[PDB]
């Protein structure tokens, strides 16, 4: 039902060689979601690595901007529901065999024949990004994805192959933590990992820290930039732009709005292209 010319393939699946040789079939396996006969491709990423063929069709990759074999985001290198919750919209797709399943895949293929360049509905909200997902977009990826999976007969100690057992050995997997949207087991741990970062301790008082030592102004931040980034928060009581240290001092009347500034700027408020400098002010008449 489907031909192709070249696969989607995020960068960690290609392997560390710029010179890889790759083979193709014409109607290979089926897609592991929609049973559609794509063209399976196979290659060797690296010299200690399994072959990692091709898992879903080009259509089921163009739907969710997903790579071709490891099923991660093509823009980030992240799972699917991390992206869809991080963009707060799911781009629904049915679950059963026909019930709207191959119907909607067929029709979304029929209205994807023109472009072949971008995902079908994610294009509008893949622009308003880079705030909540960019903190976890692991560049320089780990190639343990590509290592060959663990053999039996070392698990049973029987492996007569000796050294030339191509798969692996002495990696016993653990039966406590190992589809396409939800629910996936390590993703819950990763969203707990992002919800539970390492901040500064919240000091024992009643919201007196409306001042904060934010600095690293340099030549990027100006006065109206930071006070219009705080005017959407609310009202000041005293601003200054102290340029001996390249810093700015803002407060709020009844702290709460500047409270989310403390949530926005734990080395995190990224405007004008800079990791801003943040440590804690006085609020102590000092």
């Amino acid at each position: 039902w489907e031909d192709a010319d070249f696969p989607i393939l995020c960068q960690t699946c290609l392997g560390e060689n710029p010179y890889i040789r790759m083979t193709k079939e014409k109607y290979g396996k089926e897609c592991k979601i929609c049973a559609r006969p794509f063209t399976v491709f196979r290659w060797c990423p690296g010299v200690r690595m399994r072959f990692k063929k091709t898992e879903v069709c080009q259509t089921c990759s163009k739907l969710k901007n997903v790579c071709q074999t490891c099923l991660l985001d093509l823009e980030y290198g992240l799972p699917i529901q991390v992206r869809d919750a991080g963009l707060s919209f799911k781009d629904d797709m049915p679950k059963s065999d026909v019930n709207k399943e191959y119907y909607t895949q067929n029709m979304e293929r029929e209205i994807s024949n023109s472009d072949g360049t971008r995902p079908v509905g994610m294009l509008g909200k893949a622009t308003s990004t880079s705030d909540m997902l960019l903190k976890l977009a692991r560049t320089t990826p780990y190639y343990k994805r590509n290592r060959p999976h663990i053999c039996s007969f070392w698990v049973k100690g029987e492996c007569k192959r000796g050294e030339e057992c191509p798969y692996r050995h002495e990696k016993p997997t653990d039966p406590d933590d190992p589809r396409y949207y939800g629910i996936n087991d390590p993703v819950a741990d990763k969203l707990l990992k992002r919800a539970s970062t390492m901040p500064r301790l919240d000091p024992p008082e009643d919201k007196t820290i409306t001042t904060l030592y934010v600095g690293g102004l340099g030549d990027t931040i100006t006065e109206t930039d930071l006070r219009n980034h705080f005017y959407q928060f609310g009202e000041i009581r005293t601003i200054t732009v102290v340029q001996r240290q390249q810093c700015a001092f803002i407060q709020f009347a009844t702290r709460q709005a500047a409270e989310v500034a403390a949530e926005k700027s734990f080395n995190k408020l990224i405007v004008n292209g800079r990791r801003l400098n943040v440590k804690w002010g006085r609020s102590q008449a000092a």
């Binding site: 010319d5 070249f6 989607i8 393939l9 995020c10 560390e16 060689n17 710029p18 010179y19 890889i20 040789r21 010299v47 990759s61 163009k62 901007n65 790579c67 093509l74 823009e75 072949g116 360049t117 971008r118 995902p119 294009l123 893949a126 622009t127 990004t129 880079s130 698990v155 049973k156 100690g157 000796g162 002495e170 016993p172 997997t173 653990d174 039966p175």
Partner: protein
């Protein structure tokens, strides 16, 4: 065709509304994929050079407009000073001597190229996992 037409830059603030990946050029949803006509042999040679020794020359057309470096892990290239795999090398080091029986006379003693080499607590955890 003229150089000035295609080399003329684009006026604008570059449109930073997009992400890095969607602003980047493509034809295929993942990078601009285009045909090529490299020599088979030098492709295979520099491929095997990287596959063995972890360095190769870089393939490009318009990255910096000048590109003549090595890639992968850099320092081992100049440790061997840019030799290849099809070269009788400067030294014959860390070789590994096989024992040979190439008579085809003794039986169960002839190992030609099939010669196996001169070199020839976890199970509690494995039984508790299973």
């Amino acid at each position: 065709p003229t150089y000035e037409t295609m080399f003329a830059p684009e006026f604008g603030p570059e449109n930073p509304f997009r992400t890095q990946q969607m602003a980047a050029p493509r034809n295929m949803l993942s990078g601009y994929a285009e045909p090529a006509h490299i020599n088979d042999f030098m492709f295979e040679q520099q491929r095997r050079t990287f596959a063995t020794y972890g360095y190769a020359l870089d393939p490009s057309l318009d990255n910096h407009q000048v590109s003549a470096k090595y890639i992968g892990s850099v320092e081992e290239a100049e440790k061997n000073q840019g030799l290849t795999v099809f070269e009788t090398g400067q030294k014959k080091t860390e070789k590994r001597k096989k024992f040979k029986e190439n008579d085809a006379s003794n039986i169960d003693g002839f190992l030609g190229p099939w010669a196996k080499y001169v070199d020839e607590e976890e199970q509690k955890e494995l039984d508790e996992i299973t």
